[PDB]
């Protein structure tokens, strides 16, 4: 089977997981790998309560490694363990993907150093100090890394891989057997496209957070240099 | 604080839960919940496990219902304790909500007697035997039920409770925070727009299912009958 594992981790942002978790366990020949330091119970930064299948010292050799994103980034790009797992994997994956600030996590493990890459639009000044060339396109490929943001890029992603693990007409079948046609009644999803008042309260909103992340992507960069 | 309530249910079609609940769960003054018969594992049909957070008995009354779809339905279909539990909350909720198949039930505990709705593609000729009046349409709002079709048709119709239960730029600022600017690979995710045989791949891999439904959907008409 093909092996497909999700990084686990506490405040996890949770649709970044849930949504190209259900596309790709809808194929044929999987298996789908929660993955944390031991199974058991992981809580979502919604309050979400999701279960880790698998430990990192009994995780297969994966086909597919997808990092998501939430507020629990900061903390992941400090965990030695964690990055020393991703890095493990990603040197025999097919795909190494992430979904919003989880190409972070891959910054972080020193995956993204002259690499293509992008990551949320509040937090993309960290891709930079991480060794990567920022992007501001929704996904990135560059060899085998796709990092992509917004909370259907996993979604999207998915259907990708699956097009490429298997044909077209396989992940044609997924999409219409989930009938996936995204139709948002608003076209604020980009910083390009909300309204400049948007913008400036998300920006506001985010502000704490990116000053924790500047001082977290430093020490993780330094990490790198060494 | 509002009250929003998903039925979360064994064989569940977890992106249909999970995608509404990421988006809502971001609104201030909200409390989501995760409701079956009792707190504790419920398992999704890819064999994610999600954690029930309370019981029918306990659930507040509830601002917003939203019940998902997935392999699930027909067992829930004739469970009279989560049908009746539906039509209490229904009588009483500002919002009246369903994703894919998540409307049979609805149609089960007979909420869309002389109602529009939608449901997922292959399933659609089992509306009407329900009391409904079927609509092809990815989106149906008939007073204050909405039904909606696609796996992640619960993100989009949660920007519009969220726009109506707050404004409209709590909704865009939602969106932008989370970046949401899908983009589907493929042209598939309707059976008027994916090749013809992908649609009898996905006919014919339902065909079991539909069979199953077909009587299920009988016995529940009869009892709305009754
Ligand atoms: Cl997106
Ligand atoms: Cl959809
Ligand atoms: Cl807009
Ligand atoms: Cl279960
Ligand atoms: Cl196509």
Redesign the interface.
């Known amino acids: 089977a093909v092996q497909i594992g999700f990084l686990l981790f506490p405040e996890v ?3 970044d997981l ?2 190209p ?3 790709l ?2 194929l044929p020949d999987v298996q ?1 790998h ?1 993955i944390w330091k031991e199974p058991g ?1 992981v809580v979502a930064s ?6 880790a299948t698998t430990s990192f010292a009994d995780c297969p050799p994966l086909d597919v490694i997808c990092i998501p994103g939430g507020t629990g980034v900061g903390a992941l790009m400090e965990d030695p363990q964690a990055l020393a797992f991703i890095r493990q994997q990603a040197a025999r994956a097919r795909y190494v993907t992430s979904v ?1 600030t989880g190409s972070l996590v891959l910054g972080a493990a020193g995956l993204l150093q002259g690499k293509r890459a992008t990551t ?2 509040a937090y993309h000044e960290l891709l930079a100090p991480l060794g990567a060339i920022p992007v501001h396109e ?2 990135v490929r560059d060899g085998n890394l796709l990092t992509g ?4 890029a996993g ?3 998915a ?2 891989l699956a ?1 490429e693990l298997f044909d ?2 396989t ?3 997924v ?12 076209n ?4 390009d ?3 400049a ?3 400036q ?2 920006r506001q ?2 502000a704490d957070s990116l000053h924790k992340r500047r001082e977290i992507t430093l020490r993780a960069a330094a990490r790198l240099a060494a």
Do not use: K, N
Request: proline share 9%; with cysteine; glycine share 6%.
């Open positions: 942002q949770q649709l849930t949504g978790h259900d596309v366990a809808s789908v929660l119970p919604s309050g979400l309560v999701l279960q919003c949320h639009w929704r996904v943001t917004g909370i259907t979604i999207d992603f259907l990708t097009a077209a007409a992940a044609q079948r999409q219409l057997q989930l009938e996936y046609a995204p139709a948002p009644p608003f604020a999803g980009s910083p496209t909300a309204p008042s948007v913008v309260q998300a909103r985010a």
